[PDB]
Design a protein around this ligand. Structure first.
Ligand SMILES: CCCCCCCCCCCCCCCCCC(=O)OC[C@H](COP(=O)(O)OCCN)OC(=O)CCCCCCCCCCCCCCCCC
Ligand SMILES: CCCCCCCCCCCCCCCCCC(=O)OC[C@H](COP(=O)(O)OCCN)OC(=O)CCCCCCCCCCCCCCCCC
Ligand SMILES: CCCCCCCCCCCCCCCCCC(=O)OC[C@H](COP(=O)(O)OCCN)OC(=O)CCCCCCCCCCCCCCCCC
Ligand SMILES: CCCCCCCCCCCCCCCCCC(=O)OC[C@H](COP(=O)(O)OCCN)OC(=O)CCCCCCCCCCCCCCCCC
Ligand SMILES: CC(C)CCC[C@@H](C)[C@H]1CC[C@H]2[C@@H]3CC=C4C[C@@H](O)CC[C@]4(C)[C@H]3CC[C@]12C
Ligand SMILES: CC(C)CCC[C@@H](C)[C@H]1CC[C@H]2[C@@H]3CC=C4C[C@@H](O)CC[C@]4(C)[C@H]3CC[C@]12C
Ligand SMILES: CC(C)CCC[C@@H](C)[C@H]1CC[C@H]2[C@@H]3CC=C4C[C@@H](O)CC[C@]4(C)[C@H]3CC[C@]12C
Ligand SMILES: CC(C)CCC[C@@H](C)[C@H]1CC[C@H]2[C@@H]3CC=C4C[C@@H](O)CC[C@]4(C)[C@H]3CC[C@]12C
Ligand SMILES: CC(C)CCC[C@@H](C)[C@H]1CC[C@H]2[C@@H]3CC=C4C[C@@H](O)CC[C@]4(C)[C@H]3CC[C@]12C
Ligand SMILES: CC(C)CCC[C@@H](C)[C@H]1CC[C@H]2[C@@H]3CC=C4C[C@@H](O)CC[C@]4(C)[C@H]3CC[C@]12C
Ligand SMILES: CC(C)CCC[C@@H](C)[C@H]1CC[C@H]2[C@@H]3CC=C4C[C@@H](O)CC[C@]4(C)[C@H]3CC[C@]12C
Ligand SMILES: CC(C)CCC[C@@H](C)[C@H]1CC[C@H]2[C@@H]3CC=C4C[C@@H](O)CC[C@]4(C)[C@H]3CC[C@]12C
Ligand SMILES: COc1ncc(C)cc1CC[C@@](O)(CC(=O)O)C(=O)O
Ligand SMILES: COc1ncc(C)cc1CC[C@@](O)(CC(=O)O)C(=O)O
Ligand SMILES: CCCCCCCCCCCCCC
Ligand SMILES: CCCCCCCCCCCCCC
Ligand SMILES: CCCCCCCCCCCCCC
Ligand SMILES: CCCCCCCCCCCCCC
Ligand SMILES: CCCCCCCCCCCCCC
Ligand SMILES: CCCCCCCCCCCCCC
Ligand code: NA
Ligand code: NA
Ligand code: NA
Ligand code: NA
Lengths: 513, 513
C-alpha cells in the first residue's frame, strides 16, 4: 500500500524534468493533425503554455522559447521574433518598474500607507477598509507582490497591538486575524488592475493588440484608467463587505493608534528626496493620463501624430530620477568656498534600479508579444477562428460572462501573465467570429486573469499571506469563490455599461473586419 | 591664487549637472545649421556622445535617450525606436552573458586558469606569457572586467610567493610587479576582440550593420573568429614581448609552483556540474562557429534560409543550463525507494543569472542600435556622406590607418562601446564615399575601439589594475603608446592581407551602392 505512495513521491520529486521531456512527445500529434505552419505554431504555443503552468522551466526562460522554435520551425525568422521582446509597451513597463523602485527606495510607499492608515481609523470594519484601500492604491504603481509584502508586517503589528472570553473571544480574534491577512492580497490583486502598469497582464493586452489588431489604438493609460478605476473601486467595496461579513462581524484602539503613529514617526521627517520622488510620480501619472485620454484633446496633439506614446512619456519622466539630486540644492554652497565639495547622490542610481527591476517579467512580456506575433504570422489565428465555428451563435454578453468565468477559474492554478498570454488570441478570434468589438472580449479576459483569490499558488501575494501561518487553504478558497463571482459580475456590468462609451465597443470596427 | 583652485574644485564637484544642463544649449546651433530632420538627429547623436563621454548620466540611461528624443523630434516613432533595443544581436549578447554567468558560478574559469598556469611554467617570461594567454583566452567568453578581476588576485599571490641586493633587486621586483599587473588588463582587452560576444563593440558592429547595410550578412561568429583570432594572437605575442622587454628583463620557482598547485587543489575535485557546463560551453562555441563559417557549408543550410541566426543557437544552448541537473543522474535512485526525494538543483537558476547579467550593457547596445536606425532613417547618413567630400581622395589603406589611429586614441578617454557607437556611421559613410567595402573601414574601427591601454579611465580592467597600487599612470601611458601603435599596425596588416579573403573586401558590394 505504501509502494504506491513512494512511487508517487518519487515521480513528484522529478516532476519538472518529466514534464519537460514528455510534453513535446504528448504534443507531437498536433503538428501532424494541423497544416504544417499552423500546426508547428500551435505546438509551440501549447508547449509554452504547459511549461508556464507546470513551472518546468523558469517563466522568463520559457518566454525565450519562440526565439528558438519559430526560426527552427520556419514560423518566423529570428530578426522578426527578437524585436518583439522590446515593443514600446515593454518600455512603459520598464519605466513603471523604475519608478516603483524609486518610490520603494526612499520609503515613500510606507509613509503614504501609514498616513492613510491614520486617516481611515482603527475600528475593525474601518481598519479593514483602510488596509484594503491602502493596498489597492499602492498596487496601481507597485507590484502586487511588493504591496502585499510591505503591508503584511504593518497588519501584523496592528493586530498584535490590538490583541496584546475563552472560546468566543478566541474565535473572534482568529477571525479578525484571518480577515486582515486575507484582505491585503485580495486588495493588491484588485488594485493592480486599475492601471496599465499596475500588473503585467494589462500590458500583455496592449502588446498582443499591437500584433492582432495593429490599427487598434484606443486603449492607453488614460482610457484603461477611466475604465478600470471605478470597476476597481466597486470590486474593492464588494470585497471589503464580503470579508467584513465573513470575518469582521459586519484601550485596544488606543494601542493600535499608538503603534501606527510610532511607526510613522519612526519613518522620520519628510526628506527632500521623498518630496522630489512624489512630485515626479505625480507628473508621471498626470502626463500618462493626459497624453491622449480619448475624450479630451491631450498634449500629444501638439506633436507629430503617431510618434509619441506612453513609453516615451514614462522613459522621459524616469530619466529625471537618474540625475536629480537627492539633497536640497542651495546657492549658498556656491558662494561658501569653505564648504565640502562632495558629489551629490541622485534620486536613484542605476545600480539600485538594476538590482530592483524584475527583468524576468520584462522577458515574460516579450515572450508573450513574440508568441502573439508568431500566432498572427503563421496563420494559426485564422485556423482558430475557423475552429470556433460552433460558438458563433452565443450572445455577446453571455460570451463575455463565460470567458470571464473560465479565465478567472483558470488563473487560480497558473500565472496571471501566462493565462492571459495563452487566452488572448482565442478571445480575439472569438470576438471576430461573433462580429463584436475585439476589445469587448479581450478586456474582460485581461481583467479576469487577475482574479486569483483561491489558492496560494494562484498569485504570489496569496503565497506571502499564506506564509504568515494564520490562514488556512479552506478559508482562502471559500473567500475566493464569492470574490471570483463578484468580480465576474462586476466586470460584466462594467463591460456592458461604461466600457462601451470609453472604448466605442457598440459598433464593429473596420480594422477588425 | 587659491580662489581659482577653489572655484575649479567647486565646478568639478558639480560637473555632471553642469554638463547635462549646458550640453543642449551648446548643441542648439546644430539644429538650425542643418536641415530640420537631419539637424535634430545630429543634435541627438551629439548629445548622447557628450553624455556618454562625460558620464553626465549612467551609460544605460543615456542609451534610453533615443526613446524620448526621436519621437519628440519627429525623427522616428516610438513603435520603431523601441524594437531596435532587442534586435537578435542583443539576444546573442544575452546568451553569451548567461553562459559567462554559468561558467563563473561553477568556478570553471578559475580551474582553467590555474591549469593553464601550471602548464605554461613559472619562469618570468614564461609566467608573463602564461598570464597573458590565460586572460586573453578567458576574455573571449567572459567580460574583460571579470577576467581581469579574477586573474589579478592569482598574480598577486604568485608575486608574493616569488618575492616572499638593495637598489638592484628592489628595482627588479618593482618592474616585475608592474609587468605582471599591466599584462593582465592588456591581455583581457586584446582577447575580448577575438569573439563577437567577447566584448560589446563587436556586437555594436553587427547591430549597426543591420541598419546601415541590411543586406550585409557576411559577418557572424565564425567569420569574425577566423578573422580576429590570428590577429589577437599576433597582438598578444607583440604585447608580451613589449612588456617583457619593458619590465621582465627580456626556491622562488618552487614556491610559485607550490602556491599555484595549492590554489588548484583548493578548487577541489572536478564536479559533475563543472563538466556539464564545460561540455555545454564547447557545444556553444562549436555550434556558433559551424553555423555558417562562409567557407564550409554549415548546419544552417539544412533549415530555411534567412531564418536561423547566432541568437537562436545561443538561446537554445543556454536554455539547457536552466533545467540540466547539477548533480549526477542515477537510475539506482528510482529503484531505491528509501532514498531522499529532494528536488535537483539545475546548473543555473534564473535568480543567479538575473543578478549576474549586466542589463545595463544590453540597454547600451540597444541604444546604439536605435541611434544607428535613427541616423539612417532621418537622412543624416546622406548628409554626413555629403560632408565627407574632401576625404574622397584619401587612399583606402591610408584611410584605414588614420581611422584606426583616431579611434584607438579616442577610446583612451571614453567607453569603447560609446566610441564605436559614435564612430561607426561616419566609418560607413566614409567607406561609401571612398568606393570601398563598408566592412573595410567598419571592422578596423570596431577592433581599434578596444585598444584602450593608456589610462585607468580608458577601460574598467585598467581601473582594476590601477586599484592595486603598484602601477603608476606614467607606466601605463608609456606602455599604452607602443601597445596602441602595434595594435594599429597589426590591424592594418590583418585588414589588408586576410580580412580581404574572409569578408570578400576586394570588390565594392552591390548592397553598398
Ligand atoms: C498541470 C497540468 C497541465 C496544465 C496545462 C495548461 C494549459 C492547458 C490549455 C488547454 C488545453 C490545451 C488546448 C486544447 C487542446 C489542444 C488543441 C487541439 O486539440 O488542437 C488540435 C485539434 C484538431 O482538430 P481537427 O482534427 O483539425 O478538427 C477537424 C477540422 N480540421 O483542434 C481542435 O480540436 C479544434 C478546436 C481548437 C480550439 C482551440 C485550440 C487551441 C487553444 C489554445 C490556443 C492558444
Ligand atoms: C504635480 C504637481 C506637484 C505634486 C503634487 C502637489 C504637491 C504635493 C505636496 C508636496 C510633496 C509632499 C511630500 C511628499 C510625500 C507625499 C505627501 C505625504 O504623504 O506626506 C505626508 C504629509 C502629511 O503628514 P505630515 O504632516 O508630514 O505628518 C507629520 C507631521 N504631523 O503630506 C502633506 O503634508 C502633503 C499632502 C499632499 C497631498 C497631495 C494630494 C494629491 C495631489 C495631486 C496628485 C496627482 C497625481 C495622483 C496620482
Ligand atoms: C569631455 C569633453 C567633451 C567630449 C566630447 C566627446 C564627443 C566628441 C565628438 C567629436 C566632436 C563633435 C562632432 C564634430 C562637431 C559637430 C559636427 C558639426 O560641426 O556639424 C555641423 C556642421 C555644419 O556645416 P555646414 O555649415 O552645413 O557646412 C556647409 C554645408 N552645409 O557640419 C560640418 O562642419 C560638416 C562636417 C561634418 C562632419 C561630421 C560631423 C558629425 C560627426 C559625428 C557623427 C556621429
Ligand atoms: C563538445 C564535445 C564535448 C566537450 C569536449 C570534450 C570533452 C572534454 C572533457 C570533459 C570535461 C572535463 C571537465 C570539465 C573542465 C574542463 C577540463 C579541465 O580543465 O579540467 C582539468 C583536467 C586536467 O587536470 P586534472 O587532471 O583534473 O587535475 C587534477 C588531477 N591531477 O582536464 C581534463 O582532464 C580534461 C581536459 C579536456 C581538454 C579539452 C580540450 C578541448 C576540447 C575541444 C573544445 C572545443 C571548443 C573550444 C572552445
Ligand atoms: C500536455 C497535456 C497537459 C495536454 C494534452 C496533450 C495531448 C495529449 C493532446 C493535445 C492535442 C491532442 C490532439 C488533438 C486532436 C487530435 C485529432 C484526432 O485524431 C484526435 C486525436 C488528436 C491527435 C489529439 C491527440 C491528443 C493531443 C495530442
Ligand atoms: C505637468 C503636470 C504634472 C502639471 C502641470 C499642469 C497640467 C495639468 C498641464 C500641463 C500641460 C497641459 C496641457 C498643455 C496643452 C494642451 C493642449 C490643448 O489643446 C488641450 C489642453 C492640454 C492637453 C493641456 C492640459 C493640461 C496640462 C497637461
Ligand atoms: C542652471 C545652472 C545655471 C546652474 C546649476 C547649478 C547646480 C549645478 C548646483 C546649484 C546648487 C548645487 C547644490 C548645492 C549644495 C550641494 C551640497 C554639496 O554636498 C554639493 C552638492 C550639492 C547638492 C550641489 C550640487 C550642484 C547644484 C545643484
Ligand atoms: C455586479 C452587479 C451589480 C451586476 C452584474 C450583473 C450583470 C451580468 C448584468 C448587469 C448589467 C447587465 C447588462 C445591461 C444591459 C444590457 C443590454 C442588452 O441589450 C443586453 C444585455 C445587457 C448587455 C446586460 C447583460 C448583463 C449585465 C452585464
Ligand atoms: C559639447 C562640446 C563638447 C562640443 C562643441 C559643441 C558646440 C560648441 C558646437 C558643436 C557644433 C558647432 C557648430 C557647427 C557648425 C556651425 C556653422 C557655422 O555657423 C559655424 C558655427 C556653427 C553654428 C558651430 C557652432 C558651435 C557648435 C554648436
Ligand atoms: C554538436 C557538436 C558540439 C559536436 C558534434 C560534432 C559536430 C562537429 C557536428 C554535429 C553536426 C554536424 C553538422 C551536421 C550537418 C552538416 C551539413 C553538411 O552539409 C556539412 C557538414 C555539417 C555542417 C556538419 C558539420 C559537423 C557538425 C557541426
Ligand atoms: C527520459 C525519461 C524516460 C526518464 C527521465 C528520468 C529523470 C527525470 C531522472 C533519472 C535520474 C534522476 C536523478 C537521480 C538522482 C537524483 C538525486 C536525488 O536528490 C533526486 C534528484 C536526482 C538528481 C534525480 C533527478 C531526476 C532524474 C534525472
Ligand atoms: C604589424 C606589422 C607586421 C605590419 C604593419 C604594416 C602595415 C601598415 C602594412 C603591412 C601590409 C601592408 C599592405 C600590403 C599590401 C598592400 C596592397 C597594395 O596594393 C596597397 C598597400 C597594401 C594594402 C599594404 C598597406 C600597408 C600594410 C597593411
Ligand atoms: C514574484 O513576482 C512575480 N513573479 C512572477 C510573475 C509572473 C509575476 C510576478 C509579480 C506579481 C504580479 O505580476 C501579479 C501576478 O502576475 O500574479 C504583480 O503585479 O505583483
Ligand atoms: C564594468 O563593466 C562595464 N561597464 C560599462 C561598460 C560600458 C562596459 C563594461 C564591461 C567592460 C567590457 O565591455 C570592455 C569595455 O567595453 O571597456 C568588457 O568586455 O569587459
Ligand atoms: C519536424 C518535427 C516537428 C515536431 C517536433 C518538434 C520538437 C521540438 C522540441 C523542442 C523542445 C524544447 C524544450 C526542451
Ligand atoms: C520544415 C522545416 C523545419 C524542419 C524542422 C522543424 C523542427 C525543428 C526543431 C528544432 C529544435 C531545436 C532545439 C534546441
Ligand atoms: C515647500 C516645498 C518644498 C519642496 C521640495 C522638493 C521639490 C522637488 C521638486 C522636484 C521637481 C522635479 C521636476 C523638475
Ligand atoms: C524645437 C527645438 C529643438 C532643439 C532643442 C531641443 C532640446 C532638447 C533637450 C533634451 C535634453 C535631454 C536630457 C536632459
Ligand atoms: C517639429 C516637431 C517637433 C517640435 C519639438 C521638437 C523638440 C522636442 C523636445 C522634447 C523634449 C522632451 C524632454 C523630456
Ligand atoms: C567520464 C565522463 C563523465 C562526464 C560527466 C558529465 C557529463 C555532462 C553531459 C552534459 C550534456 C549536455 C547536453 C545534453
Ligand atoms: Na500592482
Ligand atoms: Na494566477
Ligand atoms: Na571579454
Ligand atoms: Na575606452
Amino acid at each position: 500500500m505504501a509502494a504506491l505512495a513512494a512511487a508517487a513521491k518519487k515521480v513528484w520529486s522529478a516532476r519538472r524534468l518529466l514534464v519537460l521531456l514528455f510534453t513535446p512527445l504528448a504534443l507531437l500529434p498536433v503538428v501532424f493533425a494541423l497544416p504544417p505552419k499552423e500546426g508547428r505554431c500551435l505546438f509551440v504555443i501549447l508547449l509554452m503554455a504547459v511549461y508556464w503552468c507546470t513551472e518546468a522551466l523558469p517563466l522568463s526562460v520559457t518566454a525565450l522559447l519562440p526565439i528558438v522554435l519559430f526560426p527552427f520551425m520556419g514560423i518566423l525568422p529570428s530578426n522578426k521574433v527578437c524585436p518583439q521582446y522590446f515593443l514600446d509597451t515593454n518600455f512603459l513597463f520598464l519605466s513603471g518598474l523604475i519608478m516603483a523602485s524609486a518610490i520603494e527606495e526612499w520609503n515613500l510607499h510606507r509613509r503614504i500607507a501609514l498616513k492613510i492608515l491614520m486617516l481611515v481609523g482603527v475600528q475593525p470594519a474601518r481598519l479593514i477598509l483602510g488596509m484594503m484601500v491602502t493596498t489597492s492604491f499602492l498596487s496601481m504603481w507597485l507590484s502586487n507582490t511588493a504591496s502585499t509584502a510591505m503591508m503584511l508586517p504593518i497588519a501584523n503589528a496592528i493586530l498584535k497591538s490590538l490583541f496584546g472570553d475563552s472560546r468566543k473571544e478566541d474565535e473572534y480574534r482568529r477571525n479578525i486575524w484571518k480577515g486582515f491577512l486575507i484582505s491585503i492580497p485580495y486588495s493588491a490583486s484588485i488594485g493592480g488592475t486599475a492601471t496599465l502598469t499596475g500588473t503585467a497582464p494589462n500590458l500583455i493586452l496592449l502588446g498582443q493588440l499591437k500584433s492582432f489588431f495593429p490599427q487598434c489604438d484606443v486603449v492607453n493609460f488614460g482610457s484603461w484608467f477611466i475604465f478600470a478605476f471605478p470597476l476597481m473601486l466597486l470590486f474593492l467595496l464588494a470585497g471589503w463587505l464580503w470579508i467584513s461579513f465573513l470575518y469582521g462581524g459586519l484601550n485596544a484602539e488606543d494601542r493600535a493608534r499608538a503603534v501606527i503613529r510610532e511607526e510613522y514617526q519612526n519613518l522620520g521627517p519628510i526628506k527632500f528626496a521623498e518630496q522630489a520622488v512624489f512630485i515626479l510620480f505625480c507628473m508621471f501619472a498626470i502626463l500618462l493620463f493626459t497624453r491622449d485620454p480619448k475624450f479630451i484633446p491631450g498634449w500629444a496633439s501638439l506633436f507629430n501624430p503617431g510618434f509619441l506614446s506612453d513609453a516615451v512619456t514614462g522613459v522621459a519622466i524616469v530619466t529625471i530620477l537618474f540625475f536629480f539630486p537627492s539633497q536640497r540644492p542651495s546657492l549658498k554652497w556656491w558662494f561658501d568656498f569653505k564648504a565640502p565639495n562632495t558629489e551629490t547622490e541622485p534620486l536613484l542610481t542605476w545600480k539600485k534600479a538594476q538590482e530592483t527591476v524584475p527583468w524576468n517579467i520584462i522577458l515574460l512580456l516579450g515572450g508573450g508579444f513574440a508568441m502573439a506575433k508568431g500566432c498572427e504570422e503563421s496563420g494559426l489565428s485564422v485556423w482558430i477562428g475557423g475552429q470556433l465555428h460552433p460558438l458563433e451563435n452565443v450572445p455577446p454578453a453571455l460570451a463575455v460572462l463565460l470567458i470571464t468565468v473560465v479565465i478567472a477559474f483558470f488563473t487560480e492554478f497558473a500565472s496571471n501573465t501566462a493565462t492571459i498570454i495563452i487566452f488572448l488570441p482565442v478571445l480575439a478570434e472569438l470576438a471576430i467570429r461573433l462580429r463584436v468589438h475585439p476589445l469587448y472580449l479581450m478586456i474582460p479576459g485581461t481583467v479576469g486573469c487577475s482574479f486569483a483569490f483561491m489558492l496560494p499558488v494562484s498569485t504570489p501575494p496569496n503565497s506571502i499571506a499564506f506564509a504568515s501561518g494564520h490562514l488556512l487553504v479552506k478559508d482562502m478558497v471559500r473567500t475566493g469563490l464569492l470574490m471570483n463571482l463578484m468580480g465576474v459580475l462586476l466586470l460584466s456590468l462594467a463591460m456592458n455599461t461604461w466600457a462601451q462609451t470609453i472604448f466605442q465597443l457598440g459598433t464593429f470596427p473596420d480594422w477588425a473586419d
